[PDB]
Amino acid sequence: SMNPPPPETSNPNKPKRQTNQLQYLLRVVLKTLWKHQFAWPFQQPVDAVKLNLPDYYKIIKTPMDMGTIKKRLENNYYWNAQECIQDFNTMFTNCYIYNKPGDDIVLMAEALEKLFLQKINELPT
Ligand SMILES: Cn1cc(-c2ccccc2OCC2CC2)c2nn(CC3CCN(S(C)(=O)=O)CC3)cc2c1=O
């Protein structure tokens, strides 16, 4: 269909290894964004079938969403915090390059992104 398979969320052949930055990404960054009143469009992959968005996956090269990021963090999928930060950035980029600038979805992305960037400015060493 219009929708790709969702990104992989677990890695069965990697060690379990935390870093205090990965702990912060889950317990501070993701948890704060997840509970935000504007999170809901970003809590799962964009369902281009159900939302009737035939151009979405033509335009977006790297699908990403916070449900995938949440599962990745819970499964210790990321080897390092920069991989996770990259996924958040991708998610926001996708929204900004696809959607019309004055739309609610973009207003919502911006509020989430400000919060994200403020928490990343406080990323522990
Ligand atoms: C990340 N994302 C999520 C949703 C969405 C995924 C699941 C459920 C709802 C979703 O978007 C709802 C819109 C209200 C925020 C979505 N939907 N669309 C298509 C339209 C919907 C209507 N908006 S608008 C005029 O309201 O800003 C423009 C984009 C693009 C989307 C996107 O980039």
CB atoms within 10 A of CB 46: 23
Residues 6+ apart with CB under 8 A from 28: 119, 122
Q: What does the alpha-carbon distance between residue 17 and residue 22 come to, in Å, rounded to a whole number?
A: 9
Q: Residues with beta carbon inside 6 Å of ligand 1?
A: 41-42, 46, 51, 53, 95, 98-99, 103-105, 108
Kindly state the helix (H) or strand (E) to which residue 91 belongs, with its residue range. Answer: helix 81-98
Residues 6+ apart with CB under 8 A from 3: 45, 46, 47, 48, 49, 57
Contact 67, 45 (CB under 8 A): yes
- Closest C-alpha residue for ligand 1 atom 7: 41
- Closest C-alpha residue for ligand 1 atom 25: 103
Domain ranges within the chain, ordered by starting residue? 19-123
